[PDB]
Design a protein around this ligand. Structure first.
Ligand SMILES: Cc1cccc2c(=O)[nH]c(CCCN3CC=C(c4ccc(F)cc4)CC3)nc12
Length: 350
């Protein structure tokens, strides 16, 4: 039976498991009993991205209101809601639409998770940890606990536990190091852009089955570039909080994955309200949301000339803005390299 170190095995059984896939889908409203995730298709999801984009032209451009209502009604058929009852939401504003843009994001990694699954195995020989983990195409080291490395890391969750989000408060269950296969290569280019930074990528867990196979990713062509504060790239945080929220760990599951990426920022476009891009102007190689808290300048460690902002909840001078913490974005995928995972226990304050 498996081989593997032991939270690697559990990591498999957490990130690879069927029940919870239904659970996300459920919380986006999705009507499992209409639309079973054997449905889930790259295909029917991609079509849905084009209808939410359909609604967007039209909303920012007047439109038949005899269009809008059916594009909503189109949005439904293809992605069946358990609603239900109660008065469904209209795709004729920015908000409700963006809402449905997350569900599809997620639908994407969840498909890739379950659809992942389906391959290897009447097997067995090679048991059900090493075949999933085998298909991850990723390798997983357990950082020892006592190490200055695990140490450093834990300062970083510490100090950038933020103010406002307390609360919950937070802790490190396991700490995995990762090379996924050949991502050195791709990043190669980007191993020599200036301004590189370890930042959090937090996501709902159900996601990491195909973030570990597909690498972190960006919305398809089909998707509303209005669906996203900075258009569609790849979003990242420096406070561990802004990211950790995205695990959607609740009172139970309270337990939840988070990435630490190397990211090749170079020249930061600094921004404060939304910019709907996907094209970055010339000479600029990432977007920055300029939230009012910065990780205190002061403390900024750098192993191999990546910066790490494990510095603590300080106030930036931006009052003026739409954010309260920073938000780094990069618009293609090569500019990222996954370094650590961490398993988190959410520990929800009293
Ligand atoms: C906003 C934002 C700002 C700052 C930090 C975070 C953060 O930590 N993560 C995420 C959400 C995680 C990414 N999710 C949306 C898009 C995904 C995606 C993935 C695959 C895919 F193919 C298309 C989109 C995955 C889930 N959003 C953040």
């Amino acid at each position: 039976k498996s081989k593997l170190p032991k939270p690697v095995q559990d990591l498999i059984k957490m990130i690879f498991d069927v029940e919870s896939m239904k659970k996300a889908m459920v919380e986006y409203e999705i009507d499992l009993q209409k639309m079973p995730l054997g449905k889930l298709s790259k295909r029917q999801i991609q079509a849905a991205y084009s209808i939410l984009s359909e609604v967007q032209q039209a909303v920012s451009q007047g439109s038949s209101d005899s269009q809008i209502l059916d594009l909503s009604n189109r949005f439904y058929t293809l992605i069946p809601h358990d609603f239900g009852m109660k008065k469904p939401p209209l795709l004729n504003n920015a908000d409700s639409v963006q809402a449905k843009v997350e569900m599809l994001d997620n639908l994407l990694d969840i498909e890739v998770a379950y659809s992942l699954l389906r391959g290897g195995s009447d097997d067995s020989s090679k048991d059900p940890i090493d075949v999933n983990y085998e298909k991850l195409k990723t390798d997983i080291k357990v950082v020892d606990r006592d190490s200055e490395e695990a140490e450093i890391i834990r300062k970083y969750v510490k100090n950038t536990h933020a103010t406002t989000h307390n609360a919950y408060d937070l802790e490190v269950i396991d700490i995995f190091k990762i090379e996924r296969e050949g991502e050195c290569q791709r990043y190669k280019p980007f191993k020599q852009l200036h301004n590189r930074r370890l930042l959090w990528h937090g996501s709902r867990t159900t996601n990491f089955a195909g973030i570990l196979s597909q690498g972190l990713r960006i919305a398809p062509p089909e998707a509303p570039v209005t669906g996203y504060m900075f258009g569609k790239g790849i979003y990242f945080a420096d406070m561990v909080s802004k990211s950790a929220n995205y695990c959607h760990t609740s009172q139970g599951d309270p337990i939840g994955l988070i990435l630490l990426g190397e990211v090749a920022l170079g020249n930061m476009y600094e921004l404060k309200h939304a910019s709907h891009i996907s094209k970055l102007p010339k000479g600029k190689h990432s977007v920055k949301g300029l939230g009012k808290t910065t990780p205190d300048p002061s403390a900024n460690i750098s192993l191999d000339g990546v910066d790490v902002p494990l510095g603590t909840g300080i106030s930036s001078g931006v009052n003026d803005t739409s954010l309260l913490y920073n938000e780094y974005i990069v618009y293609d995928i090569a500019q990222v390299n996954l370094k650590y995972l961490l398993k988190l226990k959410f520990n929800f304050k009293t």
